[PDB]
mmCIF file of all heavy atoms in Angstrom:
data_model
loop_
_atom_site.group_PDB
_atom_site.id
_atom_site.type_symbol
_atom_site.label_atom_id
_atom_site.label_comp_id
_atom_site.label_asym_id
_atom_site.label_seq_id
_atom_site.Cartn_x
_atom_site.Cartn_y
_atom_site.Cartn_z
ATOM 1 N N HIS Q 1 14.827 -0.402 29.023
ATOM 2 C CA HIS Q 1 14.726 -1.405 27.963
ATOM 3 C C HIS Q 1 14.401 -0.797 26.606
ATOM 4 O O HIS Q 1 15.026 -1.148 25.588
ATOM 5 C CB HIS Q 1 13.723 -2.497 28.286
ATOM 6 C CG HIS Q 1 14.152 -3.388 29.412
ATOM 7 N ND1 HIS Q 1 13.310 -4.319 29.970
ATOM 8 C CD2 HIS Q 1 15.314 -3.461 30.105
ATOM 9 C CE1 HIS Q 1 13.940 -4.946 30.950
ATOM 10 N NE2 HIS Q 1 15.163 -4.453 31.043
ATOM 11 N N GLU Q 2 13.456 0.130 26.586
ATOM 12 C CA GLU Q 2 13.125 0.776 25.303
ATOM 13 C C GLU Q 2 14.274 1.618 24.749
ATOM 14 O O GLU Q 2 14.482 1.690 23.539
ATOM 15 C CB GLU Q 2 11.862 1.620 25.453
ATOM 16 C CG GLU Q 2 10.583 0.772 25.651
ATOM 17 C CD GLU Q 2 9.327 1.641 25.644
ATOM 18 O OE1 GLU Q 2 9.493 2.862 25.487
ATOM 19 O OE2 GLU Q 2 8.186 1.123 25.800
ATOM 20 N N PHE Q 3 15.023 2.279 25.618
ATOM 21 C CA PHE Q 3 16.178 3.059 25.148
ATOM 22 C C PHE Q 3 17.241 2.165 24.501
ATOM 23 O O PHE Q 3 17.715 2.440 23.377
ATOM 24 C CB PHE Q 3 16.759 3.861 26.291
ATOM 25 C CG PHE Q 3 17.989 4.663 25.930
ATOM 26 C CD1 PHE Q 3 17.915 5.746 25.043
ATOM 27 C CD2 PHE Q 3 19.217 4.341 26.492
ATOM 28 C CE1 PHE Q 3 19.066 6.496 24.719
ATOM 29 C CE2 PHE Q 3 20.381 5.092 26.173
ATOM 30 C CZ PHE Q 3 20.299 6.164 25.293
ATOM 31 N N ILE Q 4 17.600 1.089 25.203
ATOM 32 C CA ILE Q 4 18.602 0.156 24.680
ATOM 33 C C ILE Q 4 18.161 -0.460 23.360
ATOM 34 O O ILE Q 4 18.954 -0.500 22.416
ATOM 35 C CB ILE Q 4 18.944 -0.973 25.692
ATOM 36 C CG1 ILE Q 4 19.627 -0.348 26.900
ATOM 37 C CG2 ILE Q 4 19.879 -2.037 25.022
ATOM 38 C CD1 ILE Q 4 19.611 -1.229 28.160
ATOM 39 N N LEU Q 5 16.913 -0.944 23.289
ATOM 40 C CA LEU Q 5 16.410 -1.511 22.061
ATOM 41 C C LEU Q 5 16.204 -0.523 20.914
ATOM 42 O O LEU Q 5 16.343 -0.906 19.746
ATOM 43 C CB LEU Q 5 15.130 -2.353 22.292
ATOM 44 C CG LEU Q 5 15.285 -3.479 23.320
ATOM 45 C CD1 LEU Q 5 13.956 -4.097 23.647
ATOM 46 C CD2 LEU Q 5 16.289 -4.562 22.828
ATOM 47 N N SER Q 6 15.858 0.719 21.233
ATOM 48 C CA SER Q 6 15.635 1.758 20.216
ATOM 49 C C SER Q 6 16.936 2.363 19.663
ATOM 50 O O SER Q 6 16.979 2.762 18.501
ATOM 51 C CB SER Q 6 14.811 2.934 20.808
ATOM 52 O OG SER Q 6 13.502 2.491 21.166
ATOM 53 N N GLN Q 7 17.961 2.460 20.514
ATOM 54 C CA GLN Q 7 19.209 3.176 20.165
ATOM 55 C C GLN Q 7 20.471 2.290 20.141
ATOM 56 O O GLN Q 7 21.516 2.677 19.599
ATOM 57 C CB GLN Q 7 19.418 4.382 21.107
ATOM 58 C CG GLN Q 7 18.282 5.458 21.081
ATOM 59 C CD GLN Q 7 18.049 6.057 19.706
ATOM 60 O OE1 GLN Q 7 18.931 6.044 18.853
ATOM 61 N NE2 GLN Q 7 16.840 6.526 19.462
ATOM 62 N N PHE Q 8 20.397 1.100 20.727
ATOM 63 C CA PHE Q 8 21.616 0.294 20.836
ATOM 64 C C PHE Q 8 21.339 -1.170 20.608
ATOM 65 O O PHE Q 8 22.005 -2.019 21.177
ATOM 66 C CB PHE Q 8 22.280 0.541 22.201
ATOM 67 C CG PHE Q 8 22.774 1.959 22.368
ATOM 68 C CD1 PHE Q 8 22.007 2.912 23.034
ATOM 69 C CD2 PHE Q 8 23.992 2.341 21.809
ATOM 70 C CE1 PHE Q 8 22.451 4.245 23.154
ATOM 71 C CE2 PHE Q 8 24.468 3.658 21.937
ATOM 72 C CZ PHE Q 8 23.689 4.618 22.601
ATOM 73 N N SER Q 9 20.360 -1.460 19.759
ATOM 74 C CA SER Q 9 19.962 -2.834 19.490
ATOM 75 C C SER Q 9 21.090 -3.694 18.896
ATOM 76 O O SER Q 9 21.077 -4.919 19.013
ATOM 77 C CB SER Q 9 18.745 -2.845 18.564
ATOM 78 O OG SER Q 9 19.145 -2.457 17.260
ATOM 79 N N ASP Q 10 22.029 -3.024 18.243
ATOM 80 C CA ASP Q 10 23.222 -3.574 17.588
ATOM 81 C C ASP Q 10 24.423 -3.709 18.550
ATOM 82 O O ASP Q 10 25.473 -4.244 18.196
ATOM 83 C CB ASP Q 10 23.609 -2.551 16.526
ATOM 84 C CG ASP Q 10 23.390 -1.108 17.028
ATOM 85 O OD1 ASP Q 10 23.711 -0.808 18.215
ATOM 86 O OD2 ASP Q 10 22.871 -0.284 16.255
ATOM 87 N N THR Q 11 24.278 -3.183 19.756
ATOM 88 C CA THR Q 11 25.340 -3.216 20.747
ATOM 89 C C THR Q 11 25.268 -4.523 21.557
ATOM 90 O O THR Q 11 24.189 -5.092 21.729
ATOM 91 C CB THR Q 11 25.211 -1.951 21.625
ATOM 92 O OG1 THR Q 11 25.447 -0.808 20.803
ATOM 93 C CG2 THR Q 11 26.184 -1.951 22.791
ATOM 94 N N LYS Q 12 26.406 -5.014 22.032
ATOM 95 C CA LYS Q 12 26.420 -6.277 22.788
ATOM 96 C C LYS Q 12 26.164 -6.106 24.280
ATOM 97 O O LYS Q 12 25.457 -6.886 24.892
ATOM 98 C CB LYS Q 12 27.749 -7.015 22.579
ATOM 99 C CG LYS Q 12 27.720 -8.065 21.482
ATOM 100 C CD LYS Q 12 27.346 -7.475 20.121
ATOM 101 C CE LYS Q 12 26.375 -8.391 19.380
ATOM 102 N NZ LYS Q 12 25.025 -8.369 20.041
ATOM 103 N N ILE Q 13 26.743 -5.065 24.860
ATOM 104 C CA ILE Q 13 26.882 -4.939 26.314
ATOM 105 C C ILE Q 13 26.603 -3.500 26.697
ATOM 106 O O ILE Q 13 27.105 -2.593 26.033
ATOM 107 C CB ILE Q 13 28.354 -5.311 26.737
ATOM 108 C CG1 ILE Q 13 28.711 -6.731 26.273
ATOM 109 C CG2 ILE Q 13 28.601 -5.106 28.260
ATOM 110 C CD1 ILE Q 13 27.898 -7.814 26.965
ATOM 111 N N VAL Q 14 25.768 -3.301 27.725
ATOM 112 C CA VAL Q 14 25.572 -1.989 28.349
ATOM 113 C C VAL Q 14 26.147 -2.031 29.761
ATOM 114 O O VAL Q 14 25.952 -3.002 30.491
ATOM 115 C CB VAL Q 14 24.057 -1.544 28.438
ATOM 116 C CG1 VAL Q 14 23.934 -0.157 29.123
ATOM 117 C CG2 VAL Q 14 23.425 -1.516 27.052
ATOM 118 N N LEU Q 15 26.850 -0.969 30.139
ATOM 119 C CA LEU Q 15 27.386 -0.843 31.487
ATOM 120 C C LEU Q 15 26.743 0.339 32.170
ATOM 121 O O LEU Q 15 26.551 1.389 31.552
ATOM 122 C CB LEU Q 15 28.902 -0.653 31.456
ATOM 123 C CG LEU Q 15 29.704 -1.749 30.750
ATOM 124 C CD1 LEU Q 15 31.140 -1.278 30.544
ATOM 125 C CD2 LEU Q 15 29.650 -3.061 31.534
ATOM 126 N N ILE Q 16 26.419 0.154 33.452
ATOM 127 C CA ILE Q 16 25.948 1.234 34.322
ATOM 128 C C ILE Q 16 26.656 1.192 35.675
ATOM 129 O O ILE Q 16 27.006 0.108 36.167
ATOM 130 C CB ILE Q 16 24.398 1.227 34.448
ATOM 131 C CG1 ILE Q 16 23.890 2.597 34.882
ATOM 132 C CG2 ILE Q 16 23.894 0.084 35.327
ATOM 133 C CD1 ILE Q 16 22.412 2.893 34.376
ATOM 134 N N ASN Q 17 26.870 2.368 36.269
ATOM 135 C CA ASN Q 17 27.834 2.482 37.378
ATOM 136 C C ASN Q 17 27.318 3.251 38.602
ATOM 137 O O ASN Q 17 27.862 4.298 38.924
ATOM 138 C CB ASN Q 17 29.107 3.154 36.853
ATOM 139 C CG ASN Q 17 29.844 2.283 35.842
ATOM 140 O OD1 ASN Q 17 30.493 1.316 36.214
ATOM 141 N ND2 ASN Q 17 29.720 2.616 34.556
ATOM 142 N N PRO Q 18 26.261 2.750 39.282
ATOM 143 C CA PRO Q 18 25.734 3.576 40.375
ATOM 144 C C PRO Q 18 26.566 3.510 41.643
ATOM 145 O O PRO Q 18 27.309 2.538 41.859
ATOM 146 C CB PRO Q 18 24.356 2.962 40.632
ATOM 147 C CG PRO Q 18 24.601 1.490 40.357
ATOM 148 C CD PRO Q 18 25.442 1.533 39.092
ATOM 149 N N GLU Q 19 26.470 4.571 42.446
ATOM 150 C CA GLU Q 19 27.005 4.602 43.811
ATOM 151 C C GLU Q 19 26.299 3.514 44.631
ATOM 152 O O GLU Q 19 25.076 3.386 44.561
ATOM 153 C CB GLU Q 19 26.707 5.979 44.404
ATOM 154 C CG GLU Q 19 27.296 6.212 45.767
ATOM 155 C CD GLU Q 19 27.056 7.621 46.266
ATOM 156 O OE1 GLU Q 19 26.588 8.483 45.505
ATOM 157 O OE2 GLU Q 19 27.378 7.871 47.437
ATOM 158 N N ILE Q 20 27.049 2.734 45.393
ATOM 159 C CA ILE Q 20 26.464 1.593 46.088
ATOM 160 C C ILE Q 20 25.351 2.072 47.047
ATOM 161 O O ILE Q 20 24.292 1.424 47.163
ATOM 162 C CB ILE Q 20 27.547 0.687 46.792
ATOM 163 C CG1 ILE Q 20 28.485 0.042 45.760
ATOM 164 C CG2 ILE Q 20 26.890 -0.385 47.669
ATOM 165 C CD1 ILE Q 20 29.483 -0.945 46.351
ATOM 166 N N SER Q 21 25.578 3.232 47.670
ATOM 167 C CA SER Q 21 24.622 3.876 48.581
ATOM 168 C C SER Q 21 23.301 4.276 47.931
ATOM 169 O O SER Q 21 22.315 4.503 48.629
ATOM 170 C CB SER Q 21 25.239 5.127 49.214
ATOM 171 O OG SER Q 21 26.089 4.804 50.300
ATOM 172 N N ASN Q 22 23.298 4.409 46.596
ATOM 173 C CA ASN Q 22 22.102 4.742 45.832
ATOM 174 C C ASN Q 22 21.289 3.455 45.672
ATOM 175 O O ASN Q 22 21.256 2.858 44.601
ATOM 176 C CB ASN Q 22 22.498 5.367 44.467
ATOM 177 C CG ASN Q 22 21.319 5.931 43.688
ATOM 178 O OD1 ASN Q 22 20.156 5.750 44.052
ATOM 179 N ND2 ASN Q 22 21.625 6.618 42.600
ATOM 180 N N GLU Q 23 20.685 3.001 46.775
ATOM 181 C CA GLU Q 23 20.007 1.710 46.826
ATOM 182 C C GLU Q 23 18.850 1.554 45.835
ATOM 183 O O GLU Q 23 18.649 0.473 45.268
ATOM 184 C CB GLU Q 23 19.564 1.406 48.276
ATOM 185 C CG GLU Q 23 20.735 1.515 49.281
ATOM 186 C CD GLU Q 23 20.393 1.114 50.716
ATOM 187 O OE1 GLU Q 23 19.285 0.603 50.993
ATOM 188 O OE2 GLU Q 23 21.265 1.316 51.588
ATOM 189 N N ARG Q 24 18.092 2.621 45.597
ATOM 190 C CA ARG Q 24 16.985 2.543 44.635
ATOM 191 C C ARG Q 24 17.444 2.308 43.195
ATOM 192 O O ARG Q 24 16.827 1.523 42.456
ATOM 193 C CB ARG Q 24 16.146 3.808 44.679
ATOM 194 C CG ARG Q 24 14.760 3.631 44.078
ATOM 195 C CD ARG Q 24 13.976 4.926 44.208
ATOM 196 N NE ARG Q 24 12.561 4.782 43.833
ATOM 197 C CZ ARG Q 24 12.115 4.902 42.585
ATOM 198 N NH1 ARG Q 24 12.988 5.167 41.600
ATOM 199 N NH2 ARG Q 24 10.809 4.768 42.325
ATOM 200 N N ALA Q 25 18.485 3.033 42.782
ATOM 201 C CA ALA Q 25 19.062 2.848 41.443
ATOM 202 C C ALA Q 25 19.570 1.413 41.251
ATOM 203 O O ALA Q 25 19.255 0.762 40.249
ATOM 204 C CB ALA Q 25 20.189 3.862 41.215
ATOM 205 N N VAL Q 26 20.316 0.904 42.244
ATOM 206 C CA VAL Q 26 20.864 -0.448 42.174
ATOM 207 C C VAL Q 26 19.707 -1.431 41.971
ATOM 208 O O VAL Q 26 19.787 -2.369 41.161
ATOM 209 C CB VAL Q 26 21.646 -0.802 43.496
ATOM 210 C CG1 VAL Q 26 21.907 -2.299 43.640
ATOM 211 C CG2 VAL Q 26 22.946 0.011 43.613
ATOM 212 N N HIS Q 27 18.643 -1.220 42.744
ATOM 213 C CA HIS Q 27 17.459 -2.073 42.691
ATOM 214 C C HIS Q 27 16.757 -2.033 41.317
ATOM 215 O O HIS Q 27 16.442 -3.071 40.715
ATOM 216 C CB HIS Q 27 16.473 -1.674 43.795
ATOM 217 C CG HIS Q 27 15.226 -2.494 43.785
ATOM 218 N ND1 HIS Q 27 15.141 -3.718 44.412
ATOM 219 C CD2 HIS Q 27 14.033 -2.299 43.176
ATOM 220 C CE1 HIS Q 27 13.935 -4.223 44.222
ATOM 221 N NE2 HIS Q 27 13.247 -3.385 43.474
ATOM 222 N N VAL Q 28 16.501 -0.830 40.833
ATOM 223 C CA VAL Q 28 15.945 -0.678 39.469
ATOM 224 C C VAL Q 28 16.844 -1.323 38.416
ATOM 225 O O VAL Q 28 16.369 -2.039 37.545
ATOM 226 C CB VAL Q 28 15.722 0.812 39.144
ATOM 227 C CG1 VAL Q 28 15.476 1.021 37.670
ATOM 228 C CG2 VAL Q 28 14.603 1.396 40.039
ATOM 229 N N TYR Q 29 18.149 -1.093 38.472
ATOM 230 C CA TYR Q 29 18.995 -1.663 37.408
ATOM 231 C C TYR Q 29 18.980 -3.180 37.495
ATOM 232 O O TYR Q 29 18.926 -3.857 36.473
ATOM 233 C CB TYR Q 29 20.435 -1.127 37.462
ATOM 234 C CG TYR Q 29 20.498 0.378 37.394
ATOM 235 C CD1 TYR Q 29 21.575 1.068 37.924
ATOM 236 C CD2 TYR Q 29 19.463 1.109 36.808
ATOM 237 C CE1 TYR Q 29 21.626 2.460 37.854
ATOM 238 C CE2 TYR Q 29 19.500 2.482 36.745
ATOM 239 C CZ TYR Q 29 20.584 3.146 37.271
ATOM 240 O OH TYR Q 29 20.609 4.503 37.195
ATOM 241 N N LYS Q 30 19.011 -3.731 38.716
ATOM 242 C CA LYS Q 30 18.884 -5.185 38.856
ATOM 243 C C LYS Q 30 17.563 -5.688 38.249
ATOM 244 O O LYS Q 30 17.543 -6.732 37.585
ATOM 245 C CB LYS Q 30 19.000 -5.652 40.321
ATOM 246 C CG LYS Q 30 20.437 -5.681 40.855
ATOM 247 C CD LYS Q 30 20.577 -6.580 42.076
ATOM 248 C CE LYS Q 30 20.412 -5.792 43.333
ATOM 249 N NZ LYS Q 30 20.746 -6.651 44.492
ATOM 250 N N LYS Q 31 16.471 -4.973 38.509
ATOM 251 C CA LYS Q 31 15.153 -5.285 37.930
ATOM 252 C C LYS Q 31 15.187 -5.300 36.402
ATOM 253 O O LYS Q 31 14.494 -6.089 35.785
ATOM 254 C CB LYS Q 31 14.114 -4.241 38.358
ATOM 255 C CG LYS Q 31 13.013 -4.726 39.268
ATOM 256 C CD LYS Q 31 11.978 -3.607 39.551
ATOM 257 C CE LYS Q 31 10.659 -3.752 38.772
ATOM 258 N NZ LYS Q 31 9.830 -4.922 39.236
ATOM 259 N N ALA Q 32 15.986 -4.398 35.821
ATOM 260 C CA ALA Q 32 16.147 -4.269 34.382
ATOM 261 C C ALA Q 32 17.023 -5.372 33.812
ATOM 262 O O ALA Q 32 17.079 -5.553 32.599
ATOM 263 C CB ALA Q 32 16.708 -2.869 34.016
ATOM 264 N N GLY Q 33 17.665 -6.147 34.678
ATOM 265 C CA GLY Q 33 18.511 -7.241 34.195
ATOM 266 C C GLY Q 33 20.004 -6.994 34.285
ATOM 267 O O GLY Q 33 20.789 -7.858 33.879
ATOM 268 N N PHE Q 34 20.410 -5.829 34.804
ATOM 269 C CA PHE Q 34 21.844 -5.565 35.031
ATOM 270 C C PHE Q 34 22.385 -6.430 36.171
ATOM 271 O O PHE Q 34 21.718 -6.620 37.189
ATOM 272 C CB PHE Q 34 22.109 -4.094 35.374
ATOM 273 C CG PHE Q 34 22.071 -3.157 34.184
ATOM 274 C CD1 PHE Q 34 20.870 -2.555 33.797
ATOM 275 C CD2 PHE Q 34 23.238 -2.847 33.487
ATOM 276 C CE1 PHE Q 34 20.825 -1.671 32.704
ATOM 277 C CE2 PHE Q 34 23.236 -1.982 32.409
ATOM 278 C CZ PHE Q 34 22.019 -1.375 32.001
ATOM 279 N N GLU Q 35 23.604 -6.930 36.015
ATOM 280 C CA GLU Q 35 24.234 -7.724 37.063
ATOM 281 C C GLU Q 35 25.508 -7.044 37.576
ATOM 282 O O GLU Q 35 26.266 -6.497 36.788
ATOM 283 C CB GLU Q 35 24.557 -9.130 36.533
ATOM 284 C CG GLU Q 35 23.314 -10.014 36.413
ATOM 285 C CD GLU Q 35 23.634 -11.448 36.007
ATOM 286 O OE1 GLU Q 35 24.591 -11.669 35.214
ATOM 287 O OE2 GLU Q 35 22.916 -12.361 36.476
ATOM 288 N N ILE Q 36 25.717 -7.059 38.891
ATOM 289 C CA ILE Q 36 26.926 -6.476 39.506
ATOM 290 C C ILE Q 36 28.128 -7.294 39.091
ATOM 291 O O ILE Q 36 28.171 -8.513 39.300
ATOM 292 C CB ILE Q 36 26.810 -6.401 41.039
ATOM 293 C CG1 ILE Q 36 25.662 -5.465 41.449
ATOM 294 C CG2 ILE Q 36 28.133 -5.937 41.686
ATOM 295 C CD1 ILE Q 36 25.205 -5.656 42.941
ATOM 296 N N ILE Q 37 29.090 -6.659 38.441
ATOM 297 C CA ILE Q 37 30.272 -7.424 38.057
ATOM 298 C C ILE Q 37 31.531 -6.990 38.812
ATOM 299 O O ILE Q 37 32.588 -7.608 38.674
ATOM 300 C CB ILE Q 37 30.524 -7.420 36.528
ATOM 301 C CG1 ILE Q 37 30.640 -6.000 35.991
ATOM 302 C CG2 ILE Q 37 29.405 -8.207 35.784
ATOM 303 C CD1 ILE Q 37 31.440 -5.882 34.686
ATOM 304 N N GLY Q 38 31.417 -5.945 39.617
ATOM 305 C CA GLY Q 38 32.561 -5.504 40.407
ATOM 306 C C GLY Q 38 32.240 -4.261 41.186
ATOM 307 O O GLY Q 38 31.128 -3.715 41.079
ATOM 308 N N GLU Q 39 33.186 -3.844 42.022
ATOM 309 C CA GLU Q 39 33.057 -2.562 42.724
ATOM 310 C C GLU Q 39 34.263 -1.702 42.416
ATOM 311 O O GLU Q 39 35.316 -2.209 42.060
ATOM 312 C CB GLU Q 39 33.008 -2.760 44.240
ATOM 313 C CG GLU Q 39 31.818 -3.536 44.749
ATOM 314 C CD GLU Q 39 31.827 -3.718 46.265
ATOM 315 O OE1 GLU Q 39 32.559 -2.995 46.991
ATOM 316 O OE2 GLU Q 39 31.063 -4.592 46.721
ATOM 317 N N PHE Q 40 34.111 -0.400 42.600
ATOM 318 C CA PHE Q 40 35.220 0.517 42.387
ATOM 319 C C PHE Q 40 34.985 1.811 43.146
ATOM 320 O O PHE Q 40 33.871 2.065 43.657
ATOM 321 C CB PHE Q 40 35.434 0.786 40.887
ATOM 322 C CG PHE Q 40 34.333 1.577 40.230
ATOM 323 C CD1 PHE Q 40 34.442 2.969 40.087
ATOM 324 C CD2 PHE Q 40 33.195 0.944 39.741
ATOM 325 C CE1 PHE Q 40 33.440 3.721 39.462
ATOM 326 C CE2 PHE Q 40 32.174 1.700 39.109
ATOM 327 C CZ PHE Q 40 32.301 3.078 38.960
ATOM 328 N N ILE Q 41 36.047 2.609 43.216
ATOM 329 C CA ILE Q 41 36.029 3.911 43.860
ATOM 330 C C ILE Q 41 36.140 4.917 42.714
ATOM 331 O O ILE Q 41 37.147 4.942 41.994
ATOM 332 C CB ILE Q 41 37.203 4.072 44.865
ATOM 333 C CG1 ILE Q 41 37.172 3.002 45.989
ATOM 334 C CG2 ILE Q 41 37.215 5.448 45.494
ATOM 335 C CD1 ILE Q 41 35.912 3.113 46.979
ATOM 336 N N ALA Q 42 35.104 5.733 42.544
ATOM 337 C CA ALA Q 42 34.994 6.602 41.355
ATOM 338 C C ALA Q 42 35.911 7.805 41.483
ATOM 339 O O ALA Q 42 35.943 8.416 42.544
ATOM 340 C CB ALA Q 42 33.552 7.065 41.180
ATOM 341 N N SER Q 43 36.626 8.163 40.402
ATOM 342 C CA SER Q 43 37.564 9.277 40.455
ATOM 343 C C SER Q 43 36.859 10.593 40.792
ATOM 344 O O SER Q 43 37.421 11.424 41.492
ATOM 345 C CB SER Q 43 38.377 9.416 39.158
ATOM 346 O OG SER Q 43 37.514 9.524 38.048
ATOM 347 N N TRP Q 44 35.619 10.739 40.340
ATOM 348 C CA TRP Q 44 34.890 12.005 40.446
ATOM 349 C C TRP Q 44 34.159 12.118 41.793
ATOM 350 O O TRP Q 44 33.736 13.208 42.191
ATOM 351 C CB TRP Q 44 33.904 12.161 39.246
ATOM 352 C CG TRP Q 44 32.797 11.149 39.256
ATOM 353 C CD1 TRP Q 44 31.568 11.291 39.837
ATOM 354 C CD2 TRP Q 44 32.819 9.825 38.689
ATOM 355 N NE1 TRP Q 44 30.835 10.144 39.684
ATOM 356 C CE2 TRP Q 44 31.574 9.227 38.981
ATOM 357 C CE3 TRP Q 44 33.769 9.090 37.966
ATOM 358 C CZ2 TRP Q 44 31.240 7.930 38.556
ATOM 359 C CZ3 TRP Q 44 33.444 7.795 37.550
ATOM 360 C CH2 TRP Q 44 32.191 7.230 37.849
ATOM 361 N N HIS Q 45 34.010 10.985 42.481
ATOM 362 C CA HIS Q 45 33.243 10.893 43.719
ATOM 363 C C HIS Q 45 33.736 9.635 44.442
ATOM 364 O O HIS Q 45 33.122 8.567 44.291
ATOM 365 C CB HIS Q 45 31.717 10.816 43.419
ATOM 366 C CG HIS Q 45 30.853 10.752 44.647
ATOM 367 N ND1 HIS Q 45 31.248 11.271 45.864
ATOM 368 C CD2 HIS Q 45 29.611 10.240 44.844
ATOM 369 C CE1 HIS Q 45 30.292 11.069 46.760
ATOM 370 N NE2 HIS Q 45 29.292 10.440 46.168
#
């Protein structure tokens, strides 16, 4: 929250893209207010 407000307060939308298996990250981002809008298969992994 502090990063977004300090560096991107003028921005509308932030996107984050964790591996579904990374359950802790998904949980933290949900806690931060991020919502799942889709799934995908990452080119790099």
Side-chain angles (χ1 to χ4, degrees):
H1 291 171
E2 290 186 0
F3 178 67
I4 294 161
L5 304 171
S6 295
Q7 300 302 337
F8 295 97
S9 72
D10 38 41
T11 295
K12 265 59 222 71
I13 303 294
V14 179
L15 303 168
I16 202 152
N17 293 285
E19 185 176 351
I20 296 185
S21 280
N22 188 352
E23 307 185 7
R24 199 178 189 273
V26 164
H27 179 85
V28 166
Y29 304 155
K30 283 200 267 188
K31 247 184 104 69
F34 283 90
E35 285 185 325
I36 297 163
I37 56 156
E39 296 179 17
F40 69 95
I41 301 294
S43 55
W44 66 91
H45 181 26

